[PDB]
């Protein structure tokens, strides 16, 4: 009976509203991912759902990816974002691109390795990403 991420995170400056196309950081066979939803989102009138690093979203695989994953809604986790955000120690940090990895609701990756650096929020919230990650900033 262990499904979601571990612990309770601090509020972080979201940068990715629904409709953004982000890169795939794992060798699952996908090239780009379209964001269509956010998990655990209660809306407000007229407000787009938005996500930050470390939280789960639902995606579709774009027209330039392997056909075996081309017409399904799938979970994923955001591991990099261009919007600068502030940590509790007063550090402002940002990356060079927005990226994510296809993961299971219970938390097993769908690829062997993750390419590039990964934010520490995602690594702390998900143990499977932490080990497969080659560099954590």
């Amino acid at each position: 009976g262990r499904s979601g991420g571990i612990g309770n995170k601090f509020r972080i400056s979201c940068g990715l509203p629904v409709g953004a196309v982000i890169n795939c950081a794992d060798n699952s066979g996908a090239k780009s991912l379209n964001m269509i939803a956010v998990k655990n989102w209660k809306g407000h009138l007229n407000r787009f759902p938005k996500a930050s690093v470390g939280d789960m979203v639902l995606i579709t695989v774009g027209r330039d990816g392997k056909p075996e994953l081309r017409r399904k809604v799938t979970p994923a986790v955001v591991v990099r974002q261009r919007k600068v955000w502030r940590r509790k120690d007063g550090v402002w940090i940002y990356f060079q691109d927005n990226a994510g990895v296809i993961i299971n609701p219970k938390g097993e990756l769908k690829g062997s390795s993750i390419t590039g650096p990964v934010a520490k929020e995602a690594a702390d919230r998900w143990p499977k990403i932490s080990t497969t990650a080659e560099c954590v900033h």
Binding site: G90, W92, I93, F95, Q96, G116, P117, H137
Partner: protein, 64 residues
Amino acid sequence: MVTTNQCSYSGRKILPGYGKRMSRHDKVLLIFLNRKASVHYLNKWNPRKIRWTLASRRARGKEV
């Protein structure tokens, strides 16, 4: 505070809670002092010819 960082572009000292850091795809972490520095770097301006930076002062002999 003893633990302070150095600006990647200008070589000046940064106090706690005073700038932004970037992580590159090559897994390198850059630290900037202000927005002026990060704009210089983003535009690919060579610091060896900006006369107020340490990189430029060393090339001129002012800084040893």
